[PDB]
Amino acid sequence: PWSGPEELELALQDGQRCVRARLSLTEGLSWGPFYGSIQTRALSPEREEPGPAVTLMVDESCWLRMLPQVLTEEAANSEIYRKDDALWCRVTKVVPSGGLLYVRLVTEPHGAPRHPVQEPVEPGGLA
């Protein structure tokens, strides 16, 4: 079927793969870390990179890529974010059983300024 949790269900309706809430996904519920990655957009898609530039790199059977991707909150009933190199999924909106849910990919402008190789002048104090 897919590689997904028991809280979720991949239903084949007319041959269509429908990602429906099996259980009622309560806001606040989360799953454990998954291995993969998500290349966040550090660019503006209205300018450059509005396509496959932003993708989640997870196992092809993994349920995370089986859900329709959204940047919005209303459609997203669950979001995937990375925390300490690993992906975590949290339920942001309470999904009724049978209801479909969309996946919100983390797109935090981290800034990506590399790691400060130039040490703070006179460390210890100030902060």
Curated annotation (Swiss-Prot):
It is found in: Nucleus. It comes from the Eukaryota. Mainly expressed in hematopoietic tissues. Expressed in the spleen, a primary site of hematopoiesis in the adult mouse, as well as in the liver and testis, but not in the heart, brain, lung, kidney, or skeletal muscle. Among hematopoietic cell lines, it is strongly expressed in erythroid and megakaryocytic cell lines. Expressed at low level in several lymphoid and early myeloid cell lines. Not expressed in mast cell and macrophage lines. Expressed in the heart, where it colocalizes with GATA4, GATA5 and GATA6. The modification Phosphoserine is found at S44. The CCHC FOG-type zinc fingers 1, 2, 3 and 5 bind directly to GATA-type zinc fingers. The Tyr residue adjacent to the last Cys of the CCHC FOG-type zinc finger is essential for the interaction with GATA-type zinc fingers. Transcription regulator that plays an essential role in erythroid and megakaryocytic cell differentiation. Essential cofactor that acts via the formation of a heterodimer with transcription factors of the GATA family GATA1, GATA2 and GATA3. Such heterodimer can both activate or repress transcriptional activity, depending on the cell and promoter context. The heterodimer formed with GATA proteins is essential to activate expression of genes such as NFE2, ITGA2B, alpha- and beta-globin, while it represses expression of KLF1. May be involved in regulation of some genes in gonads. Belongs to the FOG (Friend of GATA) family. Interacts with the N-terminal zinc-finger of GATA1, GATA2 and GATA3. Interacts with corepressor CTBP2; this interaction is however not essential for corepressor activity in erythropoiesis. Interacts with TACC3. This is Zinc finger protein ZFPM1. It comes from Mus musculus. The chain holds residues 100 to 226 of 995 of the full protein.
